[PDB]
Amino acid sequence: AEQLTEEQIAEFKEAFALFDKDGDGTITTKELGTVMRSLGQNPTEAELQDMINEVDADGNGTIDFPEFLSLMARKMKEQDSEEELIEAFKVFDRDGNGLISAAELRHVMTNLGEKLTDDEVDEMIREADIDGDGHINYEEFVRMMVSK
Template identity: 90%
Template structure:
């Protein structure tokens, strides 16, 4: 059994999410220029089995393209990811953990227990 204080866990989860989102952005940003174009977005979408039209790809970019330059930069990508995370079914997406410890704010992760 492994227990974490919620404050420690919050930082661990934030660090993990940041790393995952940076890696995801890099997967989309094929040329490494710091932006995602419709072409790059389409490449990733097709590799995931989707077949969006150019218009659909542009619509996806336009939804988060705050500066109107026709591409997605990292802050805009964060906005897109936050929307996707908010829109997912929370019960399916929440990791398998059990809150324990009540007032002291401990979290138990059964999957992280020692393996004997």
Template identity: 45%
Template sequence: MSGSLTEAQIEEIREAFSLYDKERSGWVSVQQLGGVMRALGESLTEAEIYDLANESNADFGGQVQFKDFLYVMSKRLEEQNSLVCLKQAFKIFDRSEVNSFTINEIRMVMTNLGEKMSEEDLRELFQDIDQDKDGKISFNEFVTAMRS
């Protein structure tokens, strides 16, 4: 269920949840989720809170169970960690630090890594990733390609 969370993260989430689970029932209301998230250092809009409640399988009475909330938080943290890794990988290619990179930068990185790619394969790869065909790969294009 929460395999990607450390014990410390689980405890932090449990403590924040417990601030609003006064009866220690293992449930909080959808209205209380905003407070739980603020206790975790995140400020969400009302729409984001309801999305979180839906992801957490809120019951018809508007209650969210801790185990479901923990699962959703695990997925959120996993996604955030994945995004951090993608940003770090993107920076390797974005040598000029302009939030995009060109085929020449890919060529240079691949050469530096000792990866041999034919010019045809390189162009094909670049064209597949460069969705808007502007001759540059943006971070969003990079993320889309890496997640597909």
């Protein structure tokens, strides 16, 4: 009773069409290459082959539209969970400097209904901190959120 509407499919065909320059229904390493170069990156042939191999489920050396539909689904699913984590990081990082301090984390925990001492909060930071600055940056934040 669901998965994809005609309209989503139509928009996924538009995207496929940008890459499939000659309209044969497949994207080759060299078509991938033409699109990347247009975006200011010039990958070597070996780099292009690793990107296709990643996506090529049947091993025929090219990406058809079912294969691109699979890819696009995994990717946007992933882009959603990254949006969530970036959003939760910017509410904690009250001054926007890239780093959650102990004062910032304690203030947000109190608005979440948890009145924590500075010792409690220092312990929370200490478990998550990797570079030893006593702040949580985004990388340390994601590594804690995805599992301790």
